Each structure stands twice: as structure tokens, then as C-alpha cells.
Amino acid sequence: KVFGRCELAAAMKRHGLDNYRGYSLGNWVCAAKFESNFNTQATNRNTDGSTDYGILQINSRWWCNDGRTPGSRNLCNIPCSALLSSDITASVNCAKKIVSDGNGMNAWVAWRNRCKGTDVQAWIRGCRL
Ligand SMILES: [Cl-]
Ligand SMILES: [Cl-]
Ligand SMILES: [Cl-]
Ligand SMILES: [Cl-]
Ligand SMILES: [Cl-]
Ligand SMILES: [Cl-]
Ligand code: NA
């Protein structure tokens, strides 16, 4: 499922991401934007053998199980495929866990490089929320 911008904002908010751990909706949507282009089915293989999954490109090295990342953990306790669903609940819950890990949204390299310190609220501007 490729979400529209305001559609994803709405879904993220309904799942309590809005201002979760102090990050406004604009951050999460911006992050989704540059991480996956709003596509629940986005995957990317990393050089170390791990894989990024879903709308927030959650990584199998720590957070999910894809059965093909030797030495990895499954801290969100889900198969990585659940992160690819048209339903963002799993991605959202797992993201709440990541963003509490100690380093906030810096855990997403695209957020740090492309969203952090920008006018993130542009990302939810005009959305009926
Ligand atoms: Cl699609
Ligand atoms: Cl939309
Ligand atoms: Cl915002
Ligand atoms: Cl991650
Ligand atoms: Cl594995
Ligand atoms: Cl923080
Ligand atoms: Na894993």
C-alpha cells in the first residue's frame, strides 16, 4: 500500500505516534517519506546482511525476525513481514519501541539527514486532522 501524505499522518496519529516521545507528527511523516516513499512494502538490503522493512524501514538486525540475519535480535517480537502490511499497526508499535531506545529519531538515518531541523510541519500542512 502506498499511502498518501495526509492519509498516513491520520493513520500514524490514530495509533498515537503524534508527539510520541516528543516528536510531532511532521517528523514521523517526513521520516516515512524519505525512508519508504510511503510504501508499506519497501525493503532494502544492508551491506551487513540485515534488511529494512516497511513504511519506516525497520531493520532486522535488532527489531524483527526475517530468519536470515545471523546474530540478530527480534526486540519487537514480530516477523519482519508484518512490517510490510497495508496496516501500519505493527510498524507503529515497533517504531514507538525504537524511538525510546535512547537515541530518539536519530535511529532513522533518513530522519537525521533529511528531516531533523527542517520545517517538519510542512509534512502535515493542509491535512484534515
Ligand atoms: Cl502499491
Ligand atoms: Cl492523502
Ligand atoms: Cl509537525
Ligand atoms: Cl531501524
Ligand atoms: Cl535471523
Ligand atoms: Cl529524543
Ligand atoms: Na532479526
Side-chain angles (χ1 to χ4, degrees):
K1 186 180 203 290
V2 183
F3 272 83
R5 180 176 55 90
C6 293
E7 185 192 18
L8 176 61
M12 278 173 175
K13 169 167 182 164
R14 184 176 61 92
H15 281 98
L17 253 213
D18 183 25
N19 207 21
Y20 189 85
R21 216 115 199 295
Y23 293 86
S24 62
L25 206 49
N27 287 285
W28 295 104
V29 171
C30 178
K33 176 60 172 164
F34 292 124
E35 288 286 354
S36 77
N37 206 14
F38 291 158
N39 183 6
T40 56
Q41 308 197 76
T43 59
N44 246 274
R45 197 55 163 291
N46 309 114
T47 46
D48 71 11
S50 62
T51 295
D52 295 348
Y53 295 91
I55 212 163
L56 289 178
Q57 289 294 276
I58 292 172
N59 182 241
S60 78
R61 162 56 115 264
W62 297 105
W63 305 110
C64 57
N65 173 254
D66 66 10
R68 75 143 189 212
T69 315
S72 64
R73 289 201 199 165
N74 183 12
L75 296 180
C76 290
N77 295 318
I78 42 153
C80 300
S81 55
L83 297 172
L84 303 179
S85 169
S86 55
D87 179 329
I88 69 172
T89 293
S91 287
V92 171
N93 281 342
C94 192
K96 288 180 181 175
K97 192 154 323 194
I98 292 157
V99 69
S100 308
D101 176 279
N103 314 59
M105 292 205 64
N106 293 302
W108 291 269
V109 168
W111 176 84
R112 168 161 37 85
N113 294 338
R114 314 181 66 169
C115 303
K116 192 176 177 180
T118 78
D119 187 18
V120 286
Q121 106 77 222
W123 286 106
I124 62 172
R125 209 184 301 277
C127 301
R128 187 168 188 90
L129 297 172

